[PDB]
Design an enzyme around this catalytic site. Structure first.
Site, PDB file in Angstrom:
ATOM      1  CG  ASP A 263      31.801  72.769 -92.138  1.00 42.53           C
ATOM      2  OD1 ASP A 263      32.063  73.029 -90.954  1.00 42.53           O
ATOM      3  OD2 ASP A 263      32.666  72.810 -93.036  1.00 42.53           O
TER       4      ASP A 263
ATOM      5  N   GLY B  73      38.933  75.937 -91.551  1.00 47.35           N
ATOM      6  CA  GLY B  73      39.534  76.678 -90.444  1.00 47.35           C
ATOM      7  C   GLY B  73      40.755  76.009 -89.802  1.00 47.35           C
ATOM      8  CD  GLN B  74      45.080  77.343 -85.480  1.00 49.15           C
ATOM      9  OE1 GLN B  74      44.679  78.500 -85.345  1.00 49.15           O
ATOM     10  NE2 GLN B  74      46.199  76.904 -84.914  1.00 49.15           N
ATOM     11  CB  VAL B  75      40.169  71.669 -88.076  1.00 45.57           C
ATOM     12  CG1 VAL B  75      39.758  70.360 -87.422  1.00 45.57           C
ATOM     13  CG2 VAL B  75      38.929  72.571 -88.195  1.00 45.57           C
TER      14      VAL B  75
ATOM     15  NE  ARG C  63      31.911  72.188-100.289  1.00 44.42           N
ATOM     16  CZ  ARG C  63      31.193  72.066-101.405  1.00 44.42           C
ATOM     17  NH1 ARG C  63      31.532  71.163-102.303  1.00 44.42           N
ATOM     18  NH2 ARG C  63      30.130  72.839-101.651  1.00 44.42           N
ATOM     19  CG  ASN C  64      30.579  70.638 -96.054  1.00 43.37           C
ATOM     20  OD1 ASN C  64      31.745  70.822 -95.677  1.00 43.37           O
ATOM     21  ND2 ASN C  64      29.870  71.588 -96.662  1.00 43.37           N
TER      22      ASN C  64
ATOM     23  CG  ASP D  72      28.411  74.173 -99.080  1.00 42.78           C
ATOM     24  OD1 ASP D  72      28.141  73.855-100.250  1.00 42.78           O
ATOM     25  OD2 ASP D  72      29.541  74.344 -98.663  1.00 42.78           O
TER      26      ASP D  72
ATOM     27  N   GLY E 263      42.754  68.786 -92.743  1.00 47.44           N
ATOM     28  CA  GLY E 263      41.878  69.407 -93.761  1.00 47.44           C
ATOM     29  C   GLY E 263      42.546  70.508 -94.542  1.00 47.44           C
TER      30      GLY E 263
HETATM   31  C1  LIG Z   1      40.926  62.804 -90.647  1.00 49.28           C
HETATM   32  O1  LIG Z   1      40.461  64.024 -91.233  1.00 49.28           O
HETATM   33  C2  LIG Z   1      39.526  64.801 -90.599  1.00 49.28           C
HETATM   34  C3  LIG Z   1      38.789  64.363 -89.510  1.00 49.28           C
HETATM   35  C4  LIG Z   1      37.849  65.190 -88.875  1.00 49.28           C
HETATM   36  N1  LIG Z   1      37.129  64.730 -87.827  1.00 49.28           N
HETATM   37  C5  LIG Z   1      36.211  65.498 -87.281  1.00 49.28           C
HETATM   38  C6  LIG Z   1      35.996  66.825 -87.646  1.00 49.28           C
HETATM   39  C7  LIG Z   1      36.708  67.366 -88.691  1.00 49.28           C
HETATM   40  O2  LIG Z   1      36.609  68.655 -89.123  1.00 49.28           O
HETATM   41  C8  LIG Z   1      35.620  69.487 -88.653  1.00 49.28           C
HETATM   42  C9  LIG Z   1      34.573  69.736 -89.497  1.00 49.28           C
HETATM   43  C10 LIG Z   1      33.569  70.615 -89.122  1.00 49.28           C
HETATM   44  C11 LIG Z   1      33.587  71.168 -87.846  1.00 49.28           C
HETATM   45  N2  LIG Z   1      32.608  72.115 -87.457  1.00 49.28           N
HETATM   46  C12 LIG Z   1      31.287  72.054 -87.829  1.00 49.28           C
HETATM   47  O3  LIG Z   1      30.813  71.100 -88.415  1.00 49.28           O
HETATM   48  N3  LIG Z   1      30.591  73.169 -87.462  1.00 49.28           N
HETATM   49  C13 LIG Z   1      29.204  73.439 -87.853  1.00 49.28           C
HETATM   50  C14 LIG Z   1      28.103  72.635 -87.232  1.00 49.28           C
HETATM   51  C15 LIG Z   1      28.317  74.075 -86.797  1.00 49.28           C
HETATM   52  C16 LIG Z   1      34.701  70.982 -87.010  1.00 49.28           C
HETATM   53 CL1  LIG Z   1      34.777  71.728 -85.463  1.00 49.28          CL
HETATM   54  C17 LIG Z   1      35.712  70.097 -87.413  1.00 49.28           C
HETATM   55  C18 LIG Z   1      37.668  66.525 -89.329  1.00 49.28           C
HETATM   56  C19 LIG Z   1      38.405  66.969 -90.437  1.00 49.28           C
HETATM   57  C20 LIG Z   1      39.317  66.125 -91.076  1.00 49.28           C
HETATM   58  C21 LIG Z   1      39.976  66.627 -92.302  1.00 49.28           C
HETATM   59  N4  LIG Z   1      40.969  65.969 -92.932  1.00 49.28           N
HETATM   60  O4  LIG Z   1      39.465  67.581 -92.883  1.00 49.28           O
END
Ligand SMILES: COc1cc2nccc(Oc3ccc(NC(=O)NC4CC4)c(Cl)c3)c2cc1C(N)=O
Length: 278
Positions: A173, A23-25, A159-160, A155, A22
């Site tokens: 999100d 925070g530090q995910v 994108r979400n 939001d 994609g």
């Molecule tokens: C392959 O790309 C992605 C896959 C993902 N899978 C699951 C979660 C992701 O990202 C998230 C997205 C959101 C959350 N957190 C929440 O939704 N928190 C809110 C409900 C309280 C978290 Cl941890 C992880 C992902 C992001 C990408 C990407 N390329 O951006």
């Protein structure tokens, strides 16, 4: 809001940490989080090195939102967390292989037909109207769920929305929140957030779907005139891949009066009807 470690805690040494997403995910592989698979790919949100107390609080708050909300097919679900001493706070959620829906739909602009015609292998992996209506229906179901949990997204936008396997979409999100393009007039002017302002945003999300991932309000600077014209009733034109019924649905979601917008339960029924009609 207590933390149930017996339910949720996962050993850090049973993760293989991978590439940033994609925070530090980050992507990771988890060993034994799932009884049907030995290894399962997950997404992990990790607390930054040198995070402040406020930042640490914030990620913990996000974890507790994910615990409290509960499981639904069309929401990004918590699988585990790493909270105990000896490593970073980590929030482990279901992985959505195709990433965010806006980016994905844009990638499929040359791979769209309204419906497949036999021989269907000429349209292998194409999107269709059924796909788009199906994504819409799924998001409405996920928001009906969130609404029933007394959760306002704040939001809601393409994108979400994350796309997993088997054309399953997942809302992420929620509760955490450019942004003005998704905000209802009452949100912009009165700072009112409600489930009915999320319905407005759902309308914008529908436009994003049926434009195959375009940015809302093309050619418009988002300033006081944009806000004034919105208040006066002006709306986006029909996007390139819409049906008339789906465009009318957008218009309904954009009613100036929040009480006259459809509810998400009404949208689920309606889209479900549009999906069978299609
Ligand atoms: C392959 O790309 C992605 C896959 C993902 N899978 C699951 C979660 C992701 O990202 C998230 C997205 C959101 C959350 N957190 C929440 O939704 N928190 C809110 C409900 C309280 C978290 Cl941890 C992880 C992902 C992001 C990408 C990407 N390329 O951006």
């Amino acid at each position: 809001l207590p933390y149930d470690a017996s339910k949720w805690e996962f050993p850090r040494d049973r993760l293989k940490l991978g590439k940033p997403l994609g925070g530090q995910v980050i992507e990771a592989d988890a060993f034994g989080i799932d009884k049907t698979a030995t290894c399962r790919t997950v997404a992990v949100k990790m607390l930054k090195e040198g995070a402040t107390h406020s930042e640490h609080r914030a990620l913990m708050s996000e974890l507790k939102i994910l615990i409290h909300i509960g499981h639904h097919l069309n929401v990004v679900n918590l699988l585990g967390a790493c909270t105990k001493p000896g490593g970073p706070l980590m929030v482990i959620v279901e992985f959505c292989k195709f990433g965010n829906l806006s980016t994905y739909l844009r990638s499929k602009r040359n791979e769209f037909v309204p419906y497949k015609v036999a021989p269907e292998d000429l349209y292998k992996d194409f999107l269709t109207l059924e796909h788009l209506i199906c994504y819409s229906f799924q998001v409405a179901k996920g928001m009906e769920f969130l609404a029933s949990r007394k959760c306002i997204h704040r939001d809601l936008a393409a994108r979400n929305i994350l796309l997993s396997e088997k054309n399953v979409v997942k809302i992420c999100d929620f509760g955490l929140a450019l942004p003005l393009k998704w905000m209802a007039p009452e949100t912009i002017f009165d700072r009112v957030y409600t489930i009915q302002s999320d319905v407005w945003s759902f309308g914008v999300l529908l436009w994003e779907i049926f434009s195959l991932g375009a940015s809302p309000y093309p050619g418009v600077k988002i300033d006081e005139e944009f806000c004034r014209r919105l208040k006066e009733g002006t709306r986006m034109r029909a996007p390139d891949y819409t049906t008339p019924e789906m465009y009318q649905t957008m218009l309904d979601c954009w009613h100036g009066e929040p009480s006259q917008r459809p509810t998400f339960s009404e949208l689920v029924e309606h889209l479900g009807n549009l999906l069978q009609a299609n």
